[PDB]
Nucleic acid binder design. Structure first.
Ligand SMILES: [Mg+2]
Lengths: 50, 232, 147, 83, 100, 231
RNA sequence: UAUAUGUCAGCGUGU
């Protein structure tokens, strides 16, 4: 089902795309898994810990 | 071979939209296309001057973490909306615009008072919403020209007369560009086959022209390389 | 001219204060220690380098010695004062001096996660790759060709 | 600069009295107003003391001999001044 | 909102008292960043009643963990509402869905 | 300062490890500019530096690369590898042909090549092969050409299309004078801004030109490329 | 360095 949903859009079914290095502009030798992940910010702030 | 390098020239500029734009550099020698594209992309994404909103002042508002009677959006939400406003300033380098609105409706960027030098790229950019007939909003917006991302915390360091209660600081993102991409393709010049053509696609906020941005990036790169030209 | 003036200047964070701070930390070791000090290697002396931000930057290779991961772990730093304490930190408790575990003599500085993967990927052979079978004058030519 | 003290350790041979000797030399430089036996490459007192210990110019015996010589010359000078 | 969820966000958001849930159906007579006035339908009107429900959202109230508790309206003026429909989004809520 | 004002290096330090080895330190630089400058210079020097290098060579009595000759300690492949490292400076024309003939016992240095006015050898003591038999002789025709960057022999053999004349073994051409270039970006502090970039460039060349001259040539090439859009 | 006035419980976080 995930692969079908990926195919519905213009995205590869493998889930990995080709990425280029920002600093050097050279394409990475292997495909890298990119996507969207739900990330949370925990209540452990560095400025409150110094 | 020693002096056979072909100087790239700005051939065609394609403005597919108000923000999206495409520029073409041709001809380019083998290998130079990638170098030039990477350098231009890295320079444009970081060191492009532009105008942004710095300080705001509303008559009935004392601090960001407050509410105004008759507006749907919070004061913090209003500041966040103003942060994304796109405005171009010609010569003043610092402008104070005034906005006044009343009645039920969406208060957008088109309601800002007309100034000769300034120009609003997106008049339909919504700022807030008034949900009461007697609700009235009056606002003063400070627009400054700068470079890069300067958070308000660093600007707090200035201590001349402090700030009156009611002047809200807004983080400034002076960069007009938001997306830069480049690609090298085969170029046809006379009967030479080993030539490249560079296509640069730029998505910005509409406050800068692609040709001006390319010229500025090239000037910055040349100024930086002038140190290596005379190594001493 | 007085202690009060120096206090005011360091509170105002003048430009000369940063140069003075750079001068005083040139070769003054600092003791980094983790909260659970199970064994000897739980506290080690390091040369400080001024950085921005708000988090202490730790060498990866010593993490296995500290049993520390960057998941939210915290570390404490102490400043030796007398010349004797600084010399003990430099000669006895320095990170470079601690290379073998006192428990069994095994080394404590080993690549763990990314160095090993990078070296493994770099030192590998494909039976049919780009530029196979050619002869190179040396490692410099190989680096030039790869780049 | 200094990254390791292994050569200084082998020059002294114990690694425990080496700290004491280096501390004595550093106190002599910092407080006694002495002069380094090695070029001063803007290094700290402890690093300079370790560096000059490394090439064998400073040890316990040498420091004791120099202290004895300074004491004898100061005693001779004060005796001449008294007389 | 979580792009990938489990479908239990709505239940968690509604059951907790963070969000403002309409007690009776009607239309949004007056909307504001700090208060909402809903004109209830005649079916749910009690006899001898004015017929308006007033919800006063909490704006930037300190929580037990020194965090910010803020309620933002999620309805527009004149938009019809029903019983059990969320009128304002509490902290970490997006249109009635939990958003951590 | 100004929106159009950028920081420029002022701590340019040059360390000469060897006659062909150099290390250049530039500080301070704007954040992220060190990577751009280093990558651009590295790419230009590695791929787009004009220079003269050996293209192909023919040796009497040798037909292919998998051949052997009597009296030479070094193999044909090792002879080609040694010829690859030879650095030749030509100021006369694009393509030159030199002849190397020798006989006897001992090494065959680059000083034994026939003298030509335009062709200059920066390392006359460069070793090509060793002759072990006094009756054995070595006679080869080296061809040097002017080009840019590195051209592997595979591309040349795929684009020769001259029916592969016998005895003319192809050898990789290293036109670019640079033998190795690396660049590091470190943290540098000005006043209170500790996030500035400092660029360290370590370069070894083949001896034809100084590494500083190579840096100057690369910068000049980039400036000439960019001059069209400079205003 | 001596500054304005810190002690016990309960709860929680990381190894
Ligand atoms: Mg942990």
């Amino acid at each position: 089902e995930i692969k079908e949903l990926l195919k519905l859009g213009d995205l590869p079914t493998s889930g990995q795309i080709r990425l280029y290095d920002g600093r050097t502009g050279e394409q990475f030798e292997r495909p890298v898994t990119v996507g969207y992940m739900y990330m949370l910010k925990l209540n452990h702030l560095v400025d409150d810990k110094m | 071979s020693v002096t056979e390098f072909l100087k790239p020239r700005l051939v065609d500029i394609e403005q597919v939209s108000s923000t999206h734009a495409k520029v073409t550099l041709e001809p380019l020698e083998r290998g130079f296309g990638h170098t030039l594209g990477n350098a231009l992309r890295r320079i444009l994404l970081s060191s492009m001057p532009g105008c942004a909103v710095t300080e705001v002042e509303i008559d009935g508002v004392l601090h960001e973490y407050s509410t105004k009677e008759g507006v749907q959006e919070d004061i913090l939400e209003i500041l966040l909306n103003l942060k994304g406003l796109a405005v171009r300033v010609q010569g003043k380098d610092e402008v104070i615009l005034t906005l006044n609105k009343s009645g039920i409706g969406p208060v957008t960027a088109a309601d800002i008072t007309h100034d000769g030098d300034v120009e609003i790229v997106k008049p339909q950019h919504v700022i807030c919403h008034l949900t009461d007939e007697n609700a009235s909003i009056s606002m003063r917006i400070k627009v400054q020209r700068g470079r890069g991302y300067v958070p308000a915390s660093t600007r707090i360091h200035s201590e001349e007369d402090e700030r009156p209660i009611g002047r809200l600081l807004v983080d400034a993102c002076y960069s007009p560009v938001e997306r830069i991409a480049y690609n090298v393709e085969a170029a046809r010049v006379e009967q030479r086959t080993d030539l490249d053509k560079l296509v640069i696609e730029m998505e910005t906020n509409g406050t800068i022209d692609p040709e001006e941005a390319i010229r500025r990036a090239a000037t910055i790169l040349a100024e930086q390389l002038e140190a290596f030209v005379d190594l001493r | 001219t007085t202690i009060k003036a120096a206090k005011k200047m360091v509170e105002r964070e003048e430009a000369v204060v940063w140069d003075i701070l750079d001068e005083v930390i040139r070769e003054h070791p600092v003791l980094l220690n983790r909260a659970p000090t199970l064994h000897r290697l739980g506290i080690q002396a390091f040369e400080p380098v001024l950085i921005e931000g708000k988090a202490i930057q730790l060498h990866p290779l010593v993490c296995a010695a500290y049993n520390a991961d960057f998941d939210g772990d915290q570390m404490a730093v102490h400043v030796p004062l007398t010349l004797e304490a600084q010399l003990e930190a430099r000669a006895l408790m320095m990170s470079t001096n601690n290379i073998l575990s006192p428990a069994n003599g095994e080394p404590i500085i080993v690549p763990s996660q990314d160095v090993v993967l990078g070296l493994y990927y770099m030192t590998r052979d494909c039976v049919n790759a780009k530029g196979e079978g050619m002869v190179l004058t040396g490692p410099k030519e190989a680096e030039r060709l790869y780049r | 600069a200094r990254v390791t003290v292994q050569d200084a350790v082998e020059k002294i041979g114990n690694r425990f009295d080496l700290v004491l000797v280096a501390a004595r030399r550093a106190r002599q430089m910092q407080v006694g107003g002495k002069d380094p036996l090695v070029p001063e490459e803007n290094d700290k007192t402890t690093v300079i003391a370790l560096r000059e210990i490394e090439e064998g110019l400073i040890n316990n015996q040498i420091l004791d001999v120099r202290e004895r010589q300074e004491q004898q010359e100061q005693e001779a000078a004060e005796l001449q001044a008294v007389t | 909102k979580p792009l990938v969820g489990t479908g239990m966000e709505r239940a968690v958001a509604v059951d907790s008292g963070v969000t403002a849930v309409a007690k009776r159906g009607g239309v949004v007579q007056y909307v504001d960043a700090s208060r909402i006035v809903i004109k209830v339908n005649e079916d749910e009107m009690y006899p001898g009643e004015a017929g308006i429900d007033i919800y006063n959202l909490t704006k930037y109230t300190r929580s037990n963990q020194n965090t910010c508790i803020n309620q933002m309206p999620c309805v527009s003026l004149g938009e019809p509402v029903e019983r059990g429909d969320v009128l304002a989004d509490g902290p970490s809520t997006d249109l009635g869905e939990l958003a951590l």
